[PDB]
Design an enzyme around this catalytic site. Sequence first.
Site, PDB file in Angstrom:
ATOM      1  N   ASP A 130      36.112 -75.053 -20.505  1.00 35.27           N
ATOM      2  CA  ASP A 130      36.122 -75.048 -18.688  1.00 35.27           C
ATOM      3  C   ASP A 130      35.125 -75.782 -18.540  1.00 35.27           C
ATOM      4  O   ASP A 130      34.040 -75.387 -18.788  1.00 35.27           O
ATOM      5  CB  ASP A 130      36.754 -74.321 -18.402  1.00 35.27           C
ATOM      6  CG  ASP A 130      36.397 -74.649 -16.828  1.00 35.27           C
ATOM      7  OD1 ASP A 130      35.895 -75.647 -15.892  1.00 35.27           O
ATOM      8  OD2 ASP A 130      37.566 -73.716 -15.953  1.00 35.27           O
ATOM      9  N   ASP A 161      37.864 -82.458 -17.910  1.00 40.71           N
ATOM     10  CA  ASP A 161      36.857 -81.239 -17.971  1.00 40.71           C
ATOM     11  C   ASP A 161      37.768 -79.928 -18.322  1.00 40.71           C
ATOM     12  O   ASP A 161      36.766 -78.654 -18.072  1.00 40.71           O
ATOM     13  CB  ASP A 161      35.989 -80.559 -16.628  1.00 40.71           C
ATOM     14  CG  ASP A 161      36.691 -80.581 -15.109  1.00 40.71           C
ATOM     15  OD1 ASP A 161      36.318 -80.643 -14.323  1.00 40.71           O
ATOM     16  OD2 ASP A 161      38.190 -80.083 -15.669  1.00 40.71           O
ATOM     17  N   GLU A 162      38.938 -79.827 -19.028  1.00 41.04           N
ATOM     18  CA  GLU A 162      39.632 -79.021 -19.472  1.00 41.04           C
ATOM     19  C   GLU A 162      40.456 -78.841 -20.292  1.00 41.04           C
ATOM     20  O   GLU A 162      41.380 -80.209 -20.755  1.00 41.04           O
ATOM     21  CB  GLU A 162      40.191 -78.481 -18.663  1.00 41.04           C
ATOM     22  CG  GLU A 162      39.903 -77.745 -16.984  1.00 41.04           C
ATOM     23  CD  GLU A 162      40.971 -77.275 -16.282  1.00 41.04           C
ATOM     24  OE1 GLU A 162      42.034 -77.436 -16.298  1.00 41.04           O
ATOM     25  OE2 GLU A 162      40.735 -76.823 -14.924  1.00 41.04           O
TER      26      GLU A 162
HETATM   27 CA   LIG Z   1      38.042 -76.573 -13.963  1.00 39.14          CA
END
Ligand SMILES: [Ca+2]
Length: 341
Positions: free
Chosen positions: A7, A105-106
Amino acid sequence: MIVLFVDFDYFYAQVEEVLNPSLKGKPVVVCVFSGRFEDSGAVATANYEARKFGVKAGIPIVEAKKILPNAVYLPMRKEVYQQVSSRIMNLLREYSEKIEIASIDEAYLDISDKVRDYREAYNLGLEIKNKILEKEKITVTVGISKNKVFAKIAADMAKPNGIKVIDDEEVKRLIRELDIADVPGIGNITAEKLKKLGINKLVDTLSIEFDKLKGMIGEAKAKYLISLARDEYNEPIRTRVRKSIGRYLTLPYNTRDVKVILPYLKKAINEAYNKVNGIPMRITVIAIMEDLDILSKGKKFKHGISIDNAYKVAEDLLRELLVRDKRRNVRRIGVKLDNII
DNA sequence: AGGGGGAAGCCG
DNA sequence: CGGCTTCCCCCT
Ligand SMILES: [Ca+2]
Ligand SMILES: [Ca+2]
């Protein structure tokens, strides 16, 4: 199964700090300006120096400026953020092929047949973190556990710049002590419905008859929650396929005049089309109305949609929505490209 | 029983 | 607030 979730910490803001090291240690507020008025629009992502004062994602920009009038407000630079992210993702691909790019973003990694122990997992998480920091100058948070959901919970617990393992035993404890609202995929609507009936933890969802749970929150999330609380979530790493690309613009005023609307819709389609690395087989037009209610009308073909018929089709869908809603004006207009190749 | 299509939900 | 994903009708 051993799953390692990555993350990227406060991503947009952090990329801004990398592009401008003089921002570090200052409140940074990455916003979506709507262009209507100056300061109109919402906050998109803020660093910890900002969010510690309540300035976080979702809040109107003018509220942000009311709380933190001297913070650094920067507009969305999604093309940059996306370049950085693609690089980090490729970087992640070296550590596993079984990888699910959950969002910008993961990302989830199935490292099962590639570690065999949680120690290796932790160490590999540190390796990954050090590598990402070294090459792209951004800090991430790594969560490691027996499945996707608990990996994500681990990350949520260790943010920012953390690393966390949730062993089997801690999973056992978590099923019992972790608020329903902290369960990934469970938002405030579901959490509120459940909270009304004393359903507060995962294990709580077991105490209530299935049909009633389903009646409150729907079959899907009911099955989900229950399987978690029983510790039977066996869901695998599914590789990508997130085939939705959208683009939305706020009209200069509210209107029902297609002569006004269509132009903004075309530009939306234009910018949508060059954001995508493939061809959509389905196009949906999306109108945000004056009472902020949202209307969608879409069409799918058995072939790709060229930009030039995206214009025509979308104009038809738009006119169709204007027949479907004879009352309200349009405030924003957008498009969603689906079924890409 | 099944796959759209469109609204509802999540979450940054 | 904004932009994606989920999900649950609905009509053969
Ligand atoms: Ca996040
Ligand atoms: Ca949650």
